[PDB]
């Protein structure tokens, strides 16, 4: 749904910031949703890492050993944005520790290592289809999926699909309990999210999120919010802008969050 008061606010925000905004909020206490351009495709940038970590957790359900599998990667695997895999190069990392790094620091090497571990880009896509997500499409490895080009469907999803996937995985029954638990623990320990949905939410709430950004000033954040009263809320905000070199607008995401949460 889309209340008139939210519609006007978001449209003004979107226009003023010369961008296109995609929003999907699911309030799991009452089942109410707020949707704005929610069925349109947006470049997901690093937010895909949530779906990747979930796919690894799903794989772990039939391989109870997998999270503790030690990966001794090498310098050739290291990318420009890889702070945690860089830190642990000498000793390697477990798959669990790779999932934590790719969620909580957006480590690009950790992502590509986990894609390889799952069996390739199409394995992530098949995982998404297995939970009913028909829109998620991962087409490139890191760091090349950040091009975020106009009307390019590679490396995109819709806000509605991502929000429904986050709901099923974190708050519903798409994963077994230990796994779903683990996915939330990773999200709540995110270190990249202070300026985005967290900045728009009450200080007393707990936010677990995954950020992403890329060219075209693309600024994204997907979160589960734990309020002081009531059930958890899913919020996905995607935003992209006119020119390739536009600067990201993390404040826009914080403002979207203020607008949406005001309605709750
Ligand atoms: C993911 O979007 C991107 C990864 N993940 C990132 C993220 O932290 O969510 C960074 S993007 C980097 C953070 N940036 C800025 N923050 C301060 C002002 S500019 C740009 C990292 C590169 C993938 C697509 O590579």
**Interstrand relation of 70-71 and 42-43 (parallel, antiparallel or unpaired):** unpaired
**Domains annotated on the chain, with CATH:** 4-262 (3.40.710.10)
Q: What is the DSSP letter of 187?
A: H
CA–CA–CA angle 60, 238, 205 (5° rounding): 70
CA of 30 to the centre of ligand 1 (A): 34
Q: For residues 244 and 256, give the distance between their C-alpha atoms in angstroms, rounded to a whole number.
A: 23
Q: For residues 50 and 165, give the distance between their C-alpha atoms in angstroms, rounded to a whole number.
A: 10
Resolution (Å) of this entry: 1.5
- Phi-psi category of 18—alpha, beta or left, where left has phi over 0 and alpha has psi -120 to 50? left
148's tokens? 């975020």
Taken as a whole, the chain contains a residue count of 264
- Hey, whose CA ends up nearest to atom 23 of ligand 1? 46
- Hey, whose CA ends up nearest to atom 5 of ligand 1? 106
Q: For residues 224 and 210, give the distance between their C-alpha atoms in angstroms, rounded to a whole number.
A: 10
126-132 contacts, C-beta under 8 A, 24 or more apart? 127/51, 127/54, 127/55, 127/58, 128/51, 128/55, 128/165, 130/58, 131/54, 131/165, 131/168, 131/169, 131/174, 132/164, 132/165, 132/168
Closest to 107 measured CA to CA, from 79, 128, 88, 129: 79
Contact 186, 100 (CB under 8 A): yes
Phi, psi values for residue 229, rounded to 5°:
-135, 140
Q: Which residues of 143-171 are buried (b: 16+ CB within 10 A; e: fewer)?
A: bebbbbeeeeeebbbbbbbbbbbbbbbbb
201's tokens? 């939410």
Give Rg (Cα) of the chain: 17
Phi, psi values for residue 208, rounded to 5°:
-120, 120
Closest to 95 measured CA to CA, from 77, 111, 76, 119: 111
CA of 213 to the centre of ligand 1 (A): 5
Residues with CB under 6 A from ligand 1: 45-46, 81, 106, 108, 142-143, 145-146, 192, 211-214, 248
Neighbours of 97 (CB within 10 A): 18
19 is an annotated ligand-binding site residue: no
Contact 232, 201 (CB under 8 A): no
Strands (E), 48-111: 70-71, 93-94
Residue to mutate (ligand 1; options 212, 214, 249, 251; most atoms within 8 A of CB): 212
48's tokens? 């895909």
33 is an annotated ligand-binding site residue: no
- Hey, whose CA ends up nearest to atom 11 of ligand 1? 213
In angstroms, how far is CA 104 from the centroid of its own chain? 11
Contact 175, 58 (CB under 8 A): yes
Q: After which residues is the chain broken (C to N over 2.5 A)?
A: none
Q: What is the DSSP letter of 168?
A: I
Catalytic site includes residue 213: no
Phi, psi values for residue 214, rounded to 5°:
-170, -165
Q: Distance between the two ends of the chain, CA-based, in angstroms?
A: 13
Atom of ligand 1 nearest to the CA of 213: 2
In angstroms, how far is CA 228 from the centroid of its own chain? 23
230 is an annotated ligand-binding site residue: no
Method: X-ray
CA of 220 to the centre of ligand 1 (A): 10
Phi, psi values for residue 213, rounded to 5°:
-155, 165
- Hey, whose CA ends up nearest to atom 17 of ligand 1? 248
Q: Which of 5, 46, 213, 262 is catalytic?
A: 46
């Amino acid at each position: 749904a889309l209340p008139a008061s939210v519609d006007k606010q978001l449209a003004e925000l979107e226009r003023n910031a010369n961008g296109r905004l995609g929003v999907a909020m699911i309030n799991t206490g009452n089942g109410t949703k707020i949707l704005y351009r929610a069925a349109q495709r947006f470049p997901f940038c690093s937010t895909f890492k949530f779906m990747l970590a979930a796919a690894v957790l799903d794989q772990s359900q039939s391989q109870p050993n997998l999270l503790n599998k030690h990966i001794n990667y090498h310098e050739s695997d290291l990318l420009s944005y890889a702070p945690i895999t860089r830190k642990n190069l000498a000793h390697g990392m477990t798959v669990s520790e790779l999932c934590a790094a790719t969620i909580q620091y957006s480590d690009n090497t950790a992502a590509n290592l986990l894609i390889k571990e799952l069996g390739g880009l199409a394995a992530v896509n098949q995982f998404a289809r297995s939970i009913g997500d028909q829109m998620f499409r991962l087409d490139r490895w890191e760091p090349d999926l950040n091009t975020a080009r106009p009307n390019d469907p590679r490396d995109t999803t819709t806000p509605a699909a991502m929000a429904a996937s986050m709901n099923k995985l974190v708050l519903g029954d798409a994963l077994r309990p230990a796994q779903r638990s683990q996915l939330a623990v990773w999200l709540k320990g995110n270190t990249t999210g202070d300026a985005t949905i967290r900045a728009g939410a009450p200080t007393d709430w707990i936010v677990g999120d995954k950020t992403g950004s890329g060219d075209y000033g693309t600024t994204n954040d997907i979160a589960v919010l734990w309020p002081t009263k009531g059930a958890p809320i899913v919020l996905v905000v995607y935003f992209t802008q006119r020119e390739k070199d536009a600067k990201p607008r993390r404040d826009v995401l914080a403002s979207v969050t203020k607008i949406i949460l005001s309605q709750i």
